[PDB]
Amino acid sequence: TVDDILEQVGESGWFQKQAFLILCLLSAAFAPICVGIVFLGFTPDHHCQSPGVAELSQRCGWSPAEELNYTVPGLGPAGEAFLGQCRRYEVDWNQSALSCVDPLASLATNRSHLPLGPCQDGWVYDTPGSSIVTEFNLVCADSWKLDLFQSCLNAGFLFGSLGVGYFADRFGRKLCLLGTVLVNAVSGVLMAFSPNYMSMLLFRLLQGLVSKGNWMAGYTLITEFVGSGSRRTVAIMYQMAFTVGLVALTGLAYALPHWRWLQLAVSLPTFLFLLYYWCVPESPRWLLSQKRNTEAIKIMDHIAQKNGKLPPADLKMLSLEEDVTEKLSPSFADLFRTPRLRKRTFILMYLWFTDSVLYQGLILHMGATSGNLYLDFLYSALVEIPGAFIALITIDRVGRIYPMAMSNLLAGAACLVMIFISPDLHWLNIIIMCVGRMGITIAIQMICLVNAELYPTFVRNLGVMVCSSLCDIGGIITPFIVFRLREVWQALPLILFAVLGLLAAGVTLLLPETKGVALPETMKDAENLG
Numbered sequence: 001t002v003d004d005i006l007e008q009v010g011e012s013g014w015f016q017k018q019a020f021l022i023l024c025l026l027s028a029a030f031a032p033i034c035v036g037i038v039f040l041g042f043t044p045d046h047h048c049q050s051p052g053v054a055e056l057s058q059r060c061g062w063s064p065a066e067e068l069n070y071t072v073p074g075l076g077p078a079g080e081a082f083l084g085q086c087r088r089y090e091v092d093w094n095q096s097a098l099s100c101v102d103p104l105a106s107l108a109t110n111r112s113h114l115p116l117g118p119c120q121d122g123w124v125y126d127t128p129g130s131s132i133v134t135e136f137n138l139v140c141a142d143s144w145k146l147d148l149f150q151s152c153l154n155a156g157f158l159f160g161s162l163g164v165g166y167f168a169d170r171f172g173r174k175l176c177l178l179g180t181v182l183v184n185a186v187s188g189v190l191m192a193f194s195p196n197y198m199s200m201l202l203f204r205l206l207q208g209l210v211s212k213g214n215w216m217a218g219y220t221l222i223t224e225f226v227g228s229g230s231r232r233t234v235a236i237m238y239q240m241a242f243t244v245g246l247v248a249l250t251g252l253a254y255a256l257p258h259w260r261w262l263q264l265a266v267s268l269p270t271f272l273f274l275l276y277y278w279c280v281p282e283s284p285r286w287l288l289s290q291k292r293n294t295e296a297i298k299i300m301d302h303i304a305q306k307n308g309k310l311p312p313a314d315l316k317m318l319s320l321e322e323d324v325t326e327k328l329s330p331s332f333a334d335l336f337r338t339p340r341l342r343k344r345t346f347i348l349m350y351l352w353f354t355d356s357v358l359y360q361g362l363i364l365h366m367g368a369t370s371g372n373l374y375l376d377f378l379y380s381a382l383v384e385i386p387g388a389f390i391a392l393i394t395i396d397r398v399g400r401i402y403p404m405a406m407s408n409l410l411a412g413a414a415c416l417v418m419i420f421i422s423p424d425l426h427w428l429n430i431i432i433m434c435v436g437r438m439g440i441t442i443a444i445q446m447i448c449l450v451n452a453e454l455y456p457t458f459v460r461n462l463g464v465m466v467c468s469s470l471c472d473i474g475g476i477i478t479p480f481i482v483f484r485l486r487e488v489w490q491a492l493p494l495i496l497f498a499v500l501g502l503l504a505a506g507v508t509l510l511l512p513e514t515k516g517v518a519l520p521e522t523m524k525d526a527e528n529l530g
């Protein structure tokens with residue numbers, strides 16, 4: 001009966017726009033946590049630091065180009081670039097060379113007979129700004145610890161997703177928003193003032209613990225607040241905030257080259273939401289799922305007062321249809337109580353894992369697009385807009401199962417097309433990648449809507465975090481899987497991606513259709529889904 005009161009009081013009102021903006025704020029302050037390693041951990045051109053090279057450079061006044069050419073051993077990178085970015089000339093350069101204009105008097109090739117040692121004086125970087133690998137020297141033998149950032153972030157995602165999902169289900173959406181936003185702000189603030197890498201790793205673990213739960217608790221609140229018809233328009237445009245945050249992250253990263261200033265800049269919307277927190281109330285469906293009737297009635301009265309429309313006479317005694325107890329049972333065994341619910345939970349878990357694996361693979365496989373890193377990130381980020389608009393015009397017309405199925409089938413076909421596509425005519429390969437990424441983004445938005453729609457209110461956050469826990473596992477194992485499979489066969493990850501996409505497209509058809517259906521409230525209501 002919550003939807004009837006929402007319709008009588010007026011859904012998608014001005015207060016709904018205000019709540020939409022202030023809750024989509026999180027979605028804009030969530031991208032630097034997830035994908036901020038692109039700008040906080042970019043690896044510039046580097047080589048070994050030789051004290052004798054600088055003396056000759058100051059003596060002859062050499063320009064940095066030919067000084068770099070005559071200084072590094074590996075002028076030609078040849079892919080690995082270990083001779084340029086790890087090798088140091090053991091022959092001294094402080095003494096006057098035979099010819100300071102590109103000296104080669106060490107040997108016939110000046111590298112074959114001259115011994116090549118590792119870096120001893122540190123590293124230099126050809127960039128006006130700073131980064132993680134710039135500050136902590138993570139380029140030659142410490143390059144594997146750059147991936148530890150994302151690894152700790154995803155492990156925190158998993159663990160804190162489960163924990164914060166249970167916390168949000170038990171103590172409500174508002175208290176979870178308080179806790180996760182506080183820990184996110186603290187974690188960013190001491191991220192930007194971390195002396196060592198271990199402190200950063202611990203704070204990245206904490207950010208992974210709270211950030212995903214914060215984002216999807218806000219998404220769950222903003223989904224439950226609107227009626228049956230505006231769920232599409234709210235849940236699709238909630239990721240417009242993420243896209244806008246991606247664009248703003250790129251712009252502020254171009255504005256601020258140093259990573260500490262970037263973290264200060266991206267830690268600000270969380271504090272400004274802390275300043276503007278009191279403008280959102282709790283979800284009335286969760287309040288009715290806790291036998292707190294008068295708080296939900298007060299929330300409806302406040303919404304009526306803010307919207308300018310008088311509350312109806314039936315707004316009082318707003319209660320559940322068959323409320324018999326507190327309905328406080330957020331359980332991990334609640335999801336697998338029924339064979340139907342266990343089937344849909346396993347389907348959503350496998351679908352989340354497949355979508356995460358496919359998204360990470362499609363992101364990683366295409367990285368040869370040259371130019372600026374900021375322009376590459378803009379091209380990767382702006383491609384989600386037309387597919388999301390295609391979604392926003394196709395959920396209402398078709399539904400929530402067929403667009404997801406087609407999108408997964410299109411992603412699998414695109415993974416099965418670019419394998420047989422020649423390396424020549426790169427424009428076709430780029431547009432095929434773009435089509436596959438478009439379908440993947442549509443499928444991710446569809447599963448984000450469907451996961452939230454197909455669960456009871458008192459199970460919803462915990463059940464989604466259980467279903468979405470396989471995304472972080474896929475994010476962890478995907479780079480290792482693609483690396484070892486690429487070592488085995490040049491195209492084996494592509495066939496595995498196509499197989500996973502085809503099986504995911506086949507699997508999602510067994511999900512119940514939830515087009516034009518109100519959110520379930522009791523245990524029996526979700527058993528009736530589809």
Ligand SMILES: CC(=O)S[C@@H]1CC2=CC(=O)CC[C@]2(C)[C@H]2CC[C@@]3(C)[C@@H](CC[C@@]34CCC(=O)O4)[C@H]12
Binds near residue numbers: 216444
């Ligand atoms: C990098 C990833 O793995 S997904 C990324 C983070 C994430 C992890 C979860 O487990 C929970 C859900 C999320 C928040 C996704 C939600 C949907 C996002 C925002 C996606 C990035 C782009 C997409 C699809 C197209 C669009 O319009 O926005 C989110």
